Design a protein around this ligand. Structure first.
Ligand SMILES: C[C@@H]1CCCC[C@H]1Oc1cccc(-c2nc3cc(C(N)=[NH2+])c(F)cc3[nH]2)c1[O-]
Lengths: 254, 96, 151
């Protein structure tokens, strides 16, 4: 997170940290004791599928205090429309092997109803993005969970304000931009998969997933988030399905 | 309407004449150039979430209904939700 | 759907109306207004009009700068969206009531404790008048619309 602050211990109770063989993979959000949402590209190169773990209650990556819980990830489900290597349909729904326990340091973020999201949350200006990713582009990742408040933009305004090229894909209806164009704040590498949470009348909801961008805090650029409102149907239907016998599952989308 | 002369300000507003133009000083419940819109008649879900704390549903020829997320129950007022669980989602326990 | 154009703010003694074009042909518009760091609030839901009174919102903090946009929906399908799943819209100019409304003891459309405030209650010492040495109201610390007209 570039230009953020430290999320005081416990103020980001839904934050998940995915690890592959002990190494940081991506961030994730907790929607309920056994389901976690992340970004699909985070699994583009996973060949040690049974070495994938999720940590909750995590704050300070160096020391260990009581509060952390680790569970293995039993299944990873990504849209059938995602293409390894791209940024569209960048969502992954993970089924933990056993549930986590909720405590003051482990609480899920509400997954909102599509209409409420599209119609009300989408117009809340600021949401928080968080993680243990780089603190500057190509900089050092963090140790204490960092959080940043970013303003959201409608694509017309994003396309209008962003500078023409770079390895920048299009902004599809499955993405949205939030951030600053003056290169002061943004999400970055290591934050990918993590949350974009919106606060509406006392509760927090999951509106986006950290997905991609031109560098991190690149001038004339904004951060791009997976628009979760477009997958709620899909998520809910999957979280009510019966376990099917694969670790990586590509589920039909729509 | 025409400037003041033709009492353009509806629903109890007062007109003020300007350089041809006029201004209508509407009453608390109406707004609009000519105090024509009733603030009290736009209880729809696209209008400040219908006043619902969490979910809103609009209904044909009948008032909109507010709802809640799993773990929450709708209260008497018809708009607010309270948690019916320990760790209701989207709540931060140390800030509660 | 076509996007509105020429969004303009018409404001006198804080009565603020936004006006735009075109006169719709089978489409409706909704307006959203905000302050740079505030949430957007919608007004004039699915209207065929080309103007939207925003007084109520801008007189909450006349010293803020507001931005507004008008969405265009085909009539019949108020859930129409474009390639990016959002409704077509266009933004207005920014407006800072306090430094841009036009002037004409006089009361304004600014309200406080359910009543209205007056020109001086709002411009206190930024407001002076002229005689020659007829009257005109002037706010010499403005950039635009510094003087009013006469009587
Ligand atoms: C963890 C997966 C393993 C497979 C290949 C990509 C890698 O993840 C990444 C590798 C390099 C960069 C990113 C990354 N840069 C990012 C930049 C931004 C931003 N400008 N706001 C962002 F939101 C997410 C990003 N994610 C990233 O998420």
């Amino acid at each position: 997170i570039v230009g953020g602050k430290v999320c005081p211990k416990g103020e980001c109770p839904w934050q998940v940290l995915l690890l592959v063989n002990g190494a940081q993979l991506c961030g994730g959000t907790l929607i309920n004791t056994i389901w976690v949402v992340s970004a699909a590209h985070c699994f583009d190169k996973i060949k040690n599928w049974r070495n994938l773990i999720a940590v909750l209650g995590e704050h300070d990556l160096s020391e260990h205090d009581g509060d952390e819980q680790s569970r293995r990830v039993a299944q990873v489900i990504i849209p059938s429309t995602y293409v390894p290597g791209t940024t569209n349909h960048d969502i992954a729904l993970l089924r933990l092997h056993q549930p986590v326990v909720l405590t003051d340091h482990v609480v899920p973020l509400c997954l909102p109803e599509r209409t409420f999201s599209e119609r009300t949350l989408a117009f809340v200006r600021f949401s928080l993005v968080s993680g243990w990713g780089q603190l500057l582009d190509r900089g050092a990742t963090a140790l204490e969970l960092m959080v940043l408040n970013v303003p959201r933009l409608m694509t017309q305004d994003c396309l209008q304000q962003s500078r023409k090229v770079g390895d920048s894909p299009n902004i599809t209806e499955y993405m949205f931009c939030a951030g600053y164009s003056d290169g002061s704040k943004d999400s970055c590498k290591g934050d990918s998969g993590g949350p974009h949470a919106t606060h509406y009348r006392g509760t927090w909801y999951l509106t986006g997933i950290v997905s991609w961008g031109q560098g991190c805090a690149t001038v004339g650029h904004f951060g791009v988030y997976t628009r979760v409102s477009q997958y709620i149907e899909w998520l809910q239907k999957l979280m009510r399905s019966e376990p099917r016998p694969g670790v990586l599952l590509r589920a039909p989308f729509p | 309407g025409d400037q003041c002369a033709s009492s353009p300000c509806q629903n109890g507003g007062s007109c003020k004449d300007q350089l041809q133009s006029y201004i209508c000083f509407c009453l608390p419940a109406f707004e609009g150039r000519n105090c024509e819109t009733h603030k009290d008649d736009q209880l729809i879900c696209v209008n400040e979430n219908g006043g619902c704390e969490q979910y809103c549903s609009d209904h044909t020829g009948t008032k909109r209904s507010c709802r809640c997320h799993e773990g929450y129950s709708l209260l008497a007022d018809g708009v607010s939700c309270t948690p019916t669980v320990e760790y209701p989602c989207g709540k931060i326990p140390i800030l509660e | 759907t076509v996007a509105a154009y020429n969004l303009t703010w018409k404001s006198t003694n804080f009565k603020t109306i936004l006006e735009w074009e075109p006169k719709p042909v089978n489409q409706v518009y909704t307006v959203q207004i905000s302050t740079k760091s505030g949430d957007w609030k919608s007004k004039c839901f699915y209207t065929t009009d080309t103007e939207c009174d925003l007084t109520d919102e801008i007189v909450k903090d006349v010293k803020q700068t507001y931005l507004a946009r008008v969405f265009s929906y085909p009539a019949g399908n108020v859930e129409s969206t474009g390639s990016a799943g959002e409704p077509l819209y266009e933004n207005s100019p920014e407006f800072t009531p306090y430094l841009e409304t036009n002037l004409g003891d006089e009361r304004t459309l600014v309200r406080r404790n359910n009543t209205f405030l007056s020109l001086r209650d709002v411009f206190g010492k930024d407001l002076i008048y002229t005689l020659y040495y007829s009257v005109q109201a002037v706010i010499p610390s403005r950039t635009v619309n510094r003087k009013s007209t006469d009587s």
